[PDB]
Amino acid sequence: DIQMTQSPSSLSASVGDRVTITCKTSQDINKYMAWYQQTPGKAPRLLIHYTSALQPGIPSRFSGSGSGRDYTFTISSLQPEDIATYYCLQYDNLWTFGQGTKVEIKRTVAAPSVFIFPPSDEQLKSGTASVVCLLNNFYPREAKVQWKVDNALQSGNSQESVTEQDSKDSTYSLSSTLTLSKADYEKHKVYACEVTHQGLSSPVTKSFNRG
């Protein structure tokens, strides 16, 4: 019957900033405290065990401290490769992982590189046309995609997704798909993707003519 509290649930910081995560146990766990890094897509990686024993191969900017019920994880100087959810683990009375801390990076504005892709010949033979818009390496993550078919704004026939933050440049990338039946696709000629973002002075329109 042991409880744990990991604070905070999420934090934002700039590259070079000091980042601190704390953990509080309901009973003394006698330094049996470990810290794990989990980057997106990948599996957890041990950074520090037994409160302050830094695993060989882990940079010196990472450190742990504490005793009793109170423990602290520090990143002395935040790096772009440090974007991850961090977990604390108590291993004295059985095993309890913390709720986790998502560490996101604050960086300078970066406008997206916009690209438009027509549906392939292979796909058209099947009777469905998927038009794709790509917004590449932008910051902040908020961006708008407006699909235009012969200057008419589209609604209800689009789906989009954004990537996790990048571990090198700290940007995001977005992909939007406009889906139509081959019949409807053949009824129009100009297919356009209009992108609005904080980093752009004026919206960017990427287009192609069917044929």
Next chain:
Amino acid sequence: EIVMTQSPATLSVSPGERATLSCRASQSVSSNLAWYQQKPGQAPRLLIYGASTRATGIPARFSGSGSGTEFTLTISSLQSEDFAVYYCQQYNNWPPLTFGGGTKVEIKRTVAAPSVFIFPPSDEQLKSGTASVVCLLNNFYPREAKVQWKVDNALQSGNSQESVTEQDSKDSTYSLSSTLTLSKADYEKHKVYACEVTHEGLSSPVTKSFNRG
């Protein structure tokens, strides 16, 4: 936790004979079982480890066997010094490391019925607050007996304490003393005071009583 059960509670074995001690586990302990010898007022001495391996310096008459949930300690030829309490220990799961309740291996002799005597409280104690009535069962065999206190045919609940001496050096018998503690007018309330004794040595329960006055 792994619950270590040591059976029987006490075992009467004559010298020169073979002493077979049992130890069971609530769940598999593999071959991670140890055996300890404990004489009164002394630290445990390791005899067996790895369920069958003998600790360095331990004489060859001591052996062990078993795996999983059932184990055995064997003393092929029981000596004079060999009479002690024996504990089994699991070291398969931790925390907690658990030990068994122990088996006291006593020297064997004939079934001796106890001499049952009841002592009323003295005037000196009665002049003070408390009143202590003593039931004595001395020079009996086997150790296990049941002394029940009865006051005006009414049984007694946690109103008494008892102690037993270590097995006699000559006639290997046991002696038990049970003290029924009351006060005034608790003792001054009732008339008949008795202790009923149940033992292997006699046919029916032995009842010894006295009337206040």
Next chain:
Amino acid sequence: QVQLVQSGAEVKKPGASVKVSCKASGFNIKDTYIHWVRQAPGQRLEWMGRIDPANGYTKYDPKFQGRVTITADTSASTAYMELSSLRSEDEAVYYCAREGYYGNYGVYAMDYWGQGTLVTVSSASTKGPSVFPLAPCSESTAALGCLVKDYFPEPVTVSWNSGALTSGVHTFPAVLQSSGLYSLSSVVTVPSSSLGTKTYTCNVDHKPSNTKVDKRVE
């Protein structure tokens, strides 16, 4: 040298049972403890249990006790986890991890983790994806990609030029179509100068349907 390889992604119906394998190599499995930890997406790591493979001793979490059974096949150098009476709530990535000894501190620590195993809880049919090229119509940089469409369940892996091309690559999270099938895109930015002097192929693998497509993009 020290590695922990887990069995592939499973799709099991509710009420059914699931067994996950964890192959240990680069070390002796009888010298370390093996833990099972689960994780739903965007949620916490939940410890389920531990096994000492040398003696087969198991310690579970009371919320997982009864439904979880962790065993070990020491000869095969593998650890198993069986989860009976599956519910929709049990859908998560299941990880195995080793807890090894540290001589310089006199302690054990959960130090290495496997890749994880996605256990999808569903009655829907497994369906292989269709792979469509993403190429521009007719700038210093150009973009190429693959549209991995109409598959079930998750996941699909996308690599470029058999792992040679990784810089400038973006494999996007899947979107859930009205059909109940997933669609995802993988893209790469390359210099416009190389769109003739170099070949570009996406390598799509959807192991639940035994699908491995290598589509060249031009």
Next chain:
Amino acid sequence: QVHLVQSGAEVKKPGASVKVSCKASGYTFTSYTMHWVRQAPGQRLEWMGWINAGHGTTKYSQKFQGRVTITRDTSASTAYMELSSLRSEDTAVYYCARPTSEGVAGPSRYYWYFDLWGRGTLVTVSSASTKGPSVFPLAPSSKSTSGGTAALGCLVKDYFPEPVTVSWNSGALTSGVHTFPAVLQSSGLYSLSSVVTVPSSSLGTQTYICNVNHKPSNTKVDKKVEPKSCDKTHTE
């Protein structure tokens, strides 16, 4: 010449703390782990926890977690066990135990069986203060007789701490003596009884005195145990 030397016995009132020492000799202290095992009077051995003497790393049983602290002094090859918030139930003998082999137990390393032990340290948890005993007789009579033998004794009541050294007739009587072990009462004061079996026929000519000596209160009590006298005699 390999032994474990423990600190002297102690009396502590409830809610207090005790720190039992354990010095080591005849081996390299840092190479082994040190465990602590307790035994309450008339009960089984109870494992408390351990200290890795080389790195200061500890592990405790969950039953003691929060009250037990284990430390080590590498400079003096000594291990310590501290038991906080003492309760009545904590009255036990405390042993420091060293396992047969070096290092820490785990998978394929089952080392938690001990060959080297300390003699023990009794820790008595009682609020009660030093008190000399009250000595009452267990008077012999026809109701104390069996086959020409009569039982008589002394009830040594309400004393603290242990021990009471009980003799009969200043050492002149040794045969047929049964001095029962001490019992801790509800009050937190010990009670004990010493009985003797003598010839029934010589009860009117022999003198039986129990000598109860209690060194902690500097009290000596000599009680004459005479046959059962009568206040009155009656009929009907």
